[PDB]
């Protein structure tokens, strides 16, 4: 299947309470593998998955050096934007950044990303051609001009198509037991009478990986999207995910409903019925 590597950075100012807090996390598909917190004691990039713990001191010293450089810069970025938007020094603001690469089933480069958001709003982003930038406001355009003059897109492109994919492939092979695997969902249904003529049927999908999944309810074979309560896919905390979908059924019509489950770990789509 396809794969991806992504780094997420969050910088938050706190006027009158020291310098901004900076948090960095790295992911391969839906598995986190590293982190850095500017408020933590170690002041080092740290492992968050067993397969990356085997990397030597050269790796950890190198990622620590680079991550602190990211921190210092994104700490300063908050000051730069406050100026661009002429905002007061009293308020707390947020800068977010994300970059990474996607690889196809053949493990070759598919797409690359590098974008920012200020206080939850898109600020600047590299376009799909990996050569131009998207800037929504005047401020963003100032950054856009600086980056065009410094030929940032070109340097970035070399990372996205080369370095990024090379490391992703390495991680996929070193942690193949967990990254190249799939945990099919374990399923079941629950039935609960809400009254004397209506009951709730809930379809469960548990302990699955990756997170991508499709859960649906049908009545006589027709979709019941508007009558189905579907919760967001959630982390179990052990590396797997969970999700459920429910529909309220008139007592006596249970047999008309079917739950359908689609997941990469299933040899074939599942069709469940309460009976």
């Amino acid at each position: 299947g396809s794969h991806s590597m992504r780094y997420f950075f969050t910088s938050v100012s706190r006027p009158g309470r020291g310098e901004p807090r900076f948090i960095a996390v790295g992911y391969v598909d839906d598995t986190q593998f590293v982190r850095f917190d500017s408020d933590a004691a170690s002041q080092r990039m740290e492992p968050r998955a067993p397969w990356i713990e085997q990397e030597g001191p050269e790796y950890w010293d190198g990622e620590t050096r680079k991550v602190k450089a990211h921190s210092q810069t994104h700490r300063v970025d908050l000051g730069t934007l406050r100026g661009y938007y002429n905002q007061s020094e009293a308020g707390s603001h947020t800068v977010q950044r994300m970059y990474g690469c996607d690889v196809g089933s053949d493990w070759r480069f598919l797409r690359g990303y590098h974008q920012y958001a200020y206080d939850g709003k898109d600020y600047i982003a590299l376009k799909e051609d990996l050569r131009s930038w998207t800037a929504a406001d005047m401020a963003a355009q100032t950054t856009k001009h600086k980056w065009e003059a410094a030929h940032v897109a070109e340097q970035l492109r070399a990372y996205l198509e080369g370095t990024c994919v090379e490391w992703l492939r390495r991680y996929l092979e070193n942690g193949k037991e967990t990254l190249q695997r799939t945990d099919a969902p374990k399923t079941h249904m629950t039935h609960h009478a809400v009254s004397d003529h209506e009951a709730t049927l809930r379809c469960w999908a548990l302990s699955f990986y990756p997170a991508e999944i499709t859960l649906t309810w049908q009545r006589d074979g027709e979709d019941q999207t508007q009558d189905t309560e579907l919760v967001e896919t959630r982390p179990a905390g052990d590396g797997t995910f969970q999700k459920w979908a429910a529909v309220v059924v008139p007592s006596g019509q249970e047999q008309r409903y079917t739950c359908h489950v689609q997941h990469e770990g299933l040899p074939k789509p599942l069709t469940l019925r309460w009976e």
Partner: peptide, 9 residues
């Protein structure tokens, strides 16, 4: 691994 060059806004 991280990108070694860090652009500035």
């Amino acid at each position: 691994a991280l990108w070694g060059f860090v652009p500035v806004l």
